[PDB]
Structures are given as structure tokens and as C-alpha cells.
Design an enzyme around this catalytic site. Structure first.
Site, mmCIF file in Angstrom:
data_model
loop_
_atom_site.group_PDB
_atom_site.id
_atom_site.type_symbol
_atom_site.label_atom_id
_atom_site.label_comp_id
_atom_site.label_asym_id
_atom_site.label_seq_id
_atom_site.Cartn_x
_atom_site.Cartn_y
_atom_site.Cartn_z
ATOM 1 N N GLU A 116 -9.038 2.540 -13.728
ATOM 2 C CA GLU A 116 -10.019 2.285 -12.781
ATOM 3 C C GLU A 116 -9.825 1.886 -11.369
ATOM 4 O O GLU A 116 -8.821 0.901 -11.539
ATOM 5 C CB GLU A 116 -11.242 1.404 -13.439
ATOM 6 C CG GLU A 116 -12.294 0.987 -12.760
ATOM 7 C CD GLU A 116 -13.250 -0.400 -13.459
ATOM 8 O OE1 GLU A 116 -12.684 -0.755 -14.374
ATOM 9 O OE2 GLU A 116 -14.154 -0.554 -12.626
ATOM 10 N N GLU A 202 -22.139 -5.698 -8.282
ATOM 11 C CA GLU A 202 -22.078 -6.425 -9.699
ATOM 12 C C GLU A 202 -22.264 -7.675 -9.669
ATOM 13 O O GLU A 202 -21.704 -8.424 -9.000
ATOM 14 C CB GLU A 202 -20.616 -6.248 -10.233
ATOM 15 C CG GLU A 202 -20.187 -5.036 -10.964
ATOM 16 C CD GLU A 202 -18.888 -4.959 -11.308
ATOM 17 O OE1 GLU A 202 -17.824 -5.299 -10.580
ATOM 18 O OE2 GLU A 202 -18.374 -4.180 -12.435
#
Length: 221
Positions: A116, A202
Site C-alpha cells: 500500500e 481518514e
């Protein structure tokens, strides 16, 4: 036309994007909710927002509402460009949240994510990345911006996180520079497949937050 949804797994598809509310981390909150709104789409440019309040679960992400590009996976060695342009804004009180691209690699087109890569344009109110040591492994300049670079595992993946040293609400660049960099300076294999390119926020906590994406585009060439 405008479509607003508040449920944990709400989503909508528009052109080459699926826009997600994705409240995966709700359960780590004592309190809060979040609604995401698609506004408009114009060529390959999406305009949207999300609104939220969250509290409790210090240090846990409550969600990752994002726009995800729908494309056929490609090995990094065959990728000519990943041009993206993004303009965003945050408002509200006591915000702890990031604003980030999230791009995922795999060993086969349908395989699990082994890597990621995140690119944080925004680190608000203490929001911290995945990192083994808590400290940068490096401070490279990529796509014209100076980054603190972090590395650590999460899930069953390794996560590289580029965290911009200045908050950066306007950006236009080739997202391939981040891969060029890793292949070159951190041993990342170019035989891997790019399989997801997602951009959103986020949040950890705050009230009356409004994250406004007034334009976002990306394409994999």
C-alpha cells in the site's frame, strides 16, 4: 445529480469512479456519524464531499470515504503515467484526519494487496501514519513536494506513507513519481500490478467537519 448517503457501506458509481462512504472503523468510536455526497461529474473530474463528527477511539481511523478509479490493472513497468489533479478543503472543529491517496499493489491482477502506498496532502490535528519506528525512513522530494516517508505493516500488507511536510490543498502531478522513487530507492519491484487508486480522507475525531473536494481526477495511462 446530487446523491447523499449515510449508511456504513453507501456508494454510487459515476463515470470511472465509485464513491464510497466506507465507515469501516465506526465500531472504534464512542460516538458520531458521517454522510458522503456526490455532486457532479464532468469529463473525468468528480466533485463531492463528506460530512462527519466522530469521537473516541484515539488513534483509530473511523472511515475512509474516497473516490476510487475503476480501471484494468497494470504492471508498474508498463505504466506511462498516473496524472491526477485534486483540490480540497476542510472545515469544522478540533479536526484529526488525513487527506490521502491510497494506491494498492498486487502480484496478480485479482490478487490480494501486498503493498500500500499513501500520499498525504493533509495531516490535520495529529493524525499519524502506519510506521514501525514512528519516524521517517527518508525525506524525499517527489512530484515537486517534500515528504516525510514512513514504512510499516498493517493488515497483511506493507504500507509506505508519503506525508507532505506542508499541508497542500491544491495539487497536480504524475502519481508515477512515487513508484519511480520506490523502485529506485526502496527496492520495490516493477513487476507488481497497480490494482486500486483511491483518494479521500481518514478521520480520527472532530465535530461538524466538512471535507469538500471541489475537483478530483486521475487516470492510469
Amino acid at each position: 445529480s446530487a446523491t447523499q448517503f449515510c449508511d456504513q457501506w453507501g456508494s454510487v458509481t459515476e463515470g470511472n469512479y465509485i464513491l464510497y462512504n466506507n465507515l469501516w472503523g465506526q465500531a472504534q468510536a464512542t460516538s458520531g456519524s458521517q454522510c458522503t455526497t456526490f455532486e457532479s461529474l464532468s469529463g473525468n473530474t468528480i466533485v463531492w464531499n463528506t460530512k462527519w463528527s466522530w469521537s473516541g477511539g484515539q488513534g483509530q481511523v473511523k472511515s475512509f470515504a474516497n473516490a476510487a478509479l475503476q480501471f484494468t490493472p497494470k504492471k508498474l513497468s508498463s505504466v506511462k503515467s498516473i496524472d491526477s489533479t485534486w483540490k480540497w478543503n476542510y472545515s469544522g472543529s478540533n479536526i484529526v484526519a488525513d487527506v490521502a491517496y491510497d494506491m494498492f499493489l498486487s502480484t496478480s491482477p485479482g490478487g490480494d494487496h501486498n503493498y500500500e502506498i499513501m500520499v498525504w496532502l493533509g495531516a490535520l490535528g495529529g493524525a499519524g501514519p502506519i510506521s514501525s519506528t514512528g519516524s521517517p525512513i527518508a525525506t524525499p522530494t517527489v512530484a515537486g513536494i517534500k515528504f516525510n516517508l514512513y514504512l510499516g505493516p498493517n493488515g497483511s500488507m506493507q504500507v509506505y506513507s508519503f506525508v507532505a511536510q506542508s499541508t497542500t490543498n491544491s495539487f497536480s502531478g504524475d502519481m508515477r513519481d512515487f513508484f519511480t522513487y520506490l523502485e529506485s530507492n526502496q527496492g520495490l519491484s516493477s513487476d507488481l500490478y497497480l490494482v486500486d487508486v483511491q483518494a479521500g480522507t481518514e478521520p480520527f475525531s472532530g465535530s461538524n467537519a466538512v471535507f469538500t473536494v471541489s475537483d478530483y481526477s486521475v487516470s492510469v495511462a
